[PDB]
Amino acid sequence: CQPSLSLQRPALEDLLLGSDASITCTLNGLRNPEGAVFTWEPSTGKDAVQKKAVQNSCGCYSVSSVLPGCAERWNSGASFKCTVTHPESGTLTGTIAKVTVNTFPPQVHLLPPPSEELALNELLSLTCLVRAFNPKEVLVRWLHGNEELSPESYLVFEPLKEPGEGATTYLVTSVLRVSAETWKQGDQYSCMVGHEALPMNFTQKTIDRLSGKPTNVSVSVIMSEGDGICY
Amino acid sequence: CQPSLSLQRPALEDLLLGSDASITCTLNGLRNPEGAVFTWEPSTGKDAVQKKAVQNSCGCYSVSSVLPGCAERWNSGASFKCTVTHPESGTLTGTIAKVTVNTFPPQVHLLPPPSEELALNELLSLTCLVRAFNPKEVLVRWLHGNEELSPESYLVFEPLKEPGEGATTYLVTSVLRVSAETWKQGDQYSCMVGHEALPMNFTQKTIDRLSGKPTNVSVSVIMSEGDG
Amino acid sequence: CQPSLSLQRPALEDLLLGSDASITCTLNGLRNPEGAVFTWEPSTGKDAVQKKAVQNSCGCYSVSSVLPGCAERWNSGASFKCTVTHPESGTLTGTIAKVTVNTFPPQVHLLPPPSEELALNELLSLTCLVRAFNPKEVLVRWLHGNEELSPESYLVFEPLKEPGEGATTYLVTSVLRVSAETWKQGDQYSCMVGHEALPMNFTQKTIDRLSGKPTNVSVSVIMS
Amino acid sequence: CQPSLSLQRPALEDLLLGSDASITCTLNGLRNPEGAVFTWEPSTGKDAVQKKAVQNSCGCYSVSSVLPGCAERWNSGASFKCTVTHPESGTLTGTIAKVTVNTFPPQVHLLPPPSEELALNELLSLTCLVRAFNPKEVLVRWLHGNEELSPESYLVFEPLKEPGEGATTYLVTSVLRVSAETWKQGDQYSCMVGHEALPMNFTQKTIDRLSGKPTNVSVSVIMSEGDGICY
Amino acid sequence: EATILADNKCMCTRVTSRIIPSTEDPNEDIVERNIRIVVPLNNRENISDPTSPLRRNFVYHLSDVCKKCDPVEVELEDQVVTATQSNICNEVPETCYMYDRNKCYTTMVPLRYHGETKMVQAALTPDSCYP
Ligand SMILES: *[C@@H]1O[C@H](CO)[C@@H](O[C@@H]2O[C@H](CO)[C@@H](O)[C@H](O)[C@H]2NC(C)=O)[C@H](O)[C@H]1NC(C)=O
Ligand SMILES: *[C@@H]1O[C@H](CO)[C@@H](O)[C@H](O)[C@H]1NC(C)=O
Ligand SMILES: *[C@@H]1O[C@H](CO)[C@@H](O)[C@H](O)[C@H]1NC(C)=O
């Protein structure tokens, strides 16, 4: 349990959906509570707030300070450095930034309910599989019609590194439990995903009992001439 | 660094993939690895292993006490007990047992790959969705044909408690990446899952390239004019 | 106002098909609308009819007469000579004849309407391409149901000399606007083309919605 | 040959291809070759030019002047006026205005060779039909395989008013004689048509050996997925 | 009465579908689609360039048929946000079979007037590309 420094990155929720992202400079492994000094190099925006010392499972202390009002700098790929003086002995520094430069925009796929779970007219599982995102953190929400569903109704599974060779990618899954009654009525359900290396902010996909698997599809091919113009 | 005693059940892998099950009684809160002498009462059977060389980041000590031969009493649903007496704390005691009150046979479904991956080449994504009972522990494996695939090829998530009321159940999902070529060529893939209550230990569901309800697709051609 | 004599060739209209074709002898560049004497030396025995004098925008006069009796000798290569005594002074002379030295019969080609129009119904453009007349004059008419259509329904474009060497020919085009319904229902359409150097009094071509066509397109629709 | 004034529009080629748009103001009838006077109502600073008078067949004199730079004004639908002083008399006046009411662009349809000559190879006739356009001037050019073809080899006919009722419209037909060899090899020909009522100055249609249909034709039509998720 | 799930303008492929009741029970219901394709018999490999061979091969990826590339708003608690609706629209332009009547298709031609060559932009769809 020796003194050590680390920087806790801003949450994706604040960067994409919220209004004020912040960075936290944290020392841990400290025997002497309080008395530590936390100085940010980019002393702009709003003053950092020093938080109270808290004991961990070993009785050592965690002491940190948070710098708010930093979303505008991160949206440009900027950087932050923290220099700290231990409450006991030494000078320690570190840096972070919001720039990885080897990202893969997400691919959001939706899997409709299994036949085994919809033939009974009970409850359905809509599975959202978001694939490929190099900075591992995802914002997953679900929509029922045009309204957001409460987060207590989602099971969102943490990101895991994908196996194999090549560029690193990760999967995230979430399951929404849906009443077969509203699926029968035709209510639309959609998965909403956030990830910074992606344009126009967020991404979404929607499914219902029309997009799902059909039965006895009718296909009509028409040969055309004219000018080859579709009207 | 306060004293405590707990019991850790055998891994499900130890009770379904053959039998090599043991219960680990953990003796915590030690300031000396020599620790304490502990006793046993899992029915009978003189077999104990004491590992003393264990430390936390706090620098404080823990002892792992292994009792082999526990599988039969997990299959019966019987209890086990562990006791120790430390110079640091006096006597610590605890028990462990299989939970049957909220134990329900599982419910497993498979999701064929999404459409975009089928239109494309490269790779696909087969998803195995598993519903777990409250005393939940799941072994998720996959088959390519009749061969077991290495865990290094899976992506398996931890269980999360489902919303609702009246019972506690969890969901897990796992994804297997499948080459488009073997998909189109007819190689079969399957999700095997091991669970406590399942009478035959393991269950299996399968995905083919033809899985699902087959359809009468009606196709016709119109040579008439009108374009579109 | 420079005096000059010219003879006007008989026009195809009335020639290969009408009776009593005629030739006109005309003096231009006159200051006196009287006294011109149009003597005719084909010696058919017919008296040319003197016509009323007319003026240009500048006041110059033009005076002419018309001889009846043409086709029977004109199409035979006869040379009709005209000498005119000038209203004011002197005489002028010239001749007219069918020139059979280097003539070319026509070729008539009809083009069905384009698919771009057929797809829209409305009216279709049936076009008659008439290639390779030696001189410029041509009679272009159409038939609808084998009945002649009025001149008001035509769009016939002036003869223009054909490009190329080793030739002396003209090209003419005509467009007929035809309701898509009559085309789809099978009304017959024809292009009639008349010209001097010819085996008959009517060379024509016909078109319909139908012909031997490359239209059996095999459409292999695949569910994959 | 009585004294008179008339005005003449710019050439359509000057309007659509070049930049030297101009208007011509012409006197006619007068008996005096001596210089007359031209006044341009727009009253531009640019040098309006009196050029060279011409004697007609009857000895009548034609005089004219040109106003340059009539570009944006015609594209904007602006009118022009000319007042002239005859050497023998007083003043005459007149105007030109662009049609901004029935500005209908043509429809262009191209036709392959007729079958009679096509069966004989030798020399083929390709034809271009320009129909249902109102203003009385059209620019028609014939192209080769992505290469302009010399005017001495194509035959363009004058516009001719269409039959029936409606806005005044004209047809134009043109014939390009084509070596049967270039046809058999599939050399690509095209009709280029230009006009001021077309939002773009020009439109193009093409002919080649496959503009019709071979006697052995098939099309591969594949519907992929079919039972997939239709979003 | 059918719901239109997809209406593409490059590959006319109106994909309607509707809930057709079954013959077994009034509760059980069936779904059926109407993939109405329109294949051009006269169009080049590419429609942006008129000097390409005729098109005798057509493939219709359903995902590409039912696409969505029009951002939408979403009431995420108290922050309305713009929403990409697919993971496909990403431009290289996509392969296109038929002309979109509501898009302008043109070609550049070297025409020689008054003695010099000029690059003139000519319409391929003259009945569209208006203001
Ligand atoms: C359709 O072909 C055209 C012809 O090249 C392509 O589009 C033009 O390509 C040139 C050369 O790269 C560019 O300068 C132009 O900007 C392009 N046109 C436009 C409107 O952008 C096009 O790539 C072809 N389509 C496909 C799928 O191959
Ligand atoms: C096609 O329709 C017949 C009609 O009786 C039915 O028996 C058959 O099962 C159907 N096939 C599929 C694949 O739906
Ligand atoms: C159809 O194909 C056959 C193949 O021999 C051919 O004889 C015929 O001319 C083609 N066209 C039509 C319209 O049948």
mmCIF file with all atom_site columns, C-alpha atoms and ligand atoms in Angstrom, chain A residues 215-216, chain B residues 213-217, ligand 2:
data_model
loop_
_atom_site.group_PDB
_atom_site.id
_atom_site.type_symbol
_atom_site.label_atom_id
_atom_site.label_alt_id
_atom_site.label_comp_id
_atom_site.label_asym_id
_atom_site.label_entity_id
_atom_site.label_seq_id
_atom_site.pdbx_PDB_ins_code
_atom_site.Cartn_x
_atom_site.Cartn_y
_atom_site.Cartn_z
_atom_site.occupancy
_atom_site.B_iso_or_equiv
_atom_site.pdbx_formal_charge
_atom_site.auth_seq_id
_atom_site.auth_comp_id
_atom_site.auth_asym_id
_atom_site.auth_atom_id
_atom_site.pdbx_PDB_model_num
ATOM   1  C CA . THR A 1 215 ? -43.292 -15.577 -43.408 1.00 0.00 ? 215 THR A CA 1
ATOM   2  C CA . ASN A 1 216 ? -43.928 -16.512 -47.052 1.00 0.00 ? 216 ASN A CA 1
ATOM   3  C CA . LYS B 2 213 ? -39.072 -21.529 -39.931 1.00 0.00 ? 213 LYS B CA 1
ATOM   4  C CA . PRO B 2 214 ? -38.721 -22.253 -43.673 1.00 0.00 ? 214 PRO B CA 1
ATOM   5  C CA . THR B 2 215 ? -40.810 -20.127 -46.007 1.00 0.00 ? 215 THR B CA 1
ATOM   6  C CA . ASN B 2 216 ? -42.727 -20.363 -49.279 1.00 0.00 ? 216 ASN B CA 1
ATOM   7  C CA . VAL B 2 217 ? -41.194 -17.352 -51.032 1.00 0.00 ? 217 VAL B CA 1
HETATM 8  C C1 . LIG F 3 .   ? -45.837 -24.122 -48.461 1.00 0.00 ? 2   LIG F C1 1
HETATM 9  O O1 . LIG F 3 .   ? -47.271 -24.224 -48.509 1.00 0.00 ? 2   LIG F O1 1
HETATM 10 C C2 . LIG F 3 .   ? -47.780 -25.549 -48.310 1.00 0.00 ? 2   LIG F C2 1
HETATM 11 C C3 . LIG F 3 .   ? -49.279 -25.469 -48.483 1.00 0.00 ? 2   LIG F C3 1
HETATM 12 O O2 . LIG F 3 .   ? -49.940 -26.523 -47.795 1.00 0.00 ? 2   LIG F O2 1
HETATM 13 C C4 . LIG F 3 .   ? -47.364 -26.055 -46.933 1.00 0.00 ? 2   LIG F C4 1
HETATM 14 O O3 . LIG F 3 .   ? -47.830 -27.387 -46.758 1.00 0.00 ? 2   LIG F O3 1
HETATM 15 C C5 . LIG F 3 .   ? -45.848 -26.008 -46.803 1.00 0.00 ? 2   LIG F C5 1
HETATM 16 O O4 . LIG F 3 .   ? -45.461 -26.392 -45.490 1.00 0.00 ? 2   LIG F O4 1
HETATM 17 C C6 . LIG F 3 .   ? -45.331 -24.602 -47.098 1.00 0.00 ? 2   LIG F C6 1
HETATM 18 N N1 . LIG F 3 .   ? -43.879 -24.575 -47.044 1.00 0.00 ? 2   LIG F N1 1
HETATM 19 C C7 . LIG F 3 .   ? -43.187 -23.655 -46.365 1.00 0.00 ? 2   LIG F C7 1
HETATM 20 C C8 . LIG F 3 .   ? -41.695 -23.785 -46.420 1.00 0.00 ? 2   LIG F C8 1
HETATM 21 O O5 . LIG F 3 .   ? -43.740 -22.759 -45.734 1.00 0.00 ? 2   LIG F O5 1
#
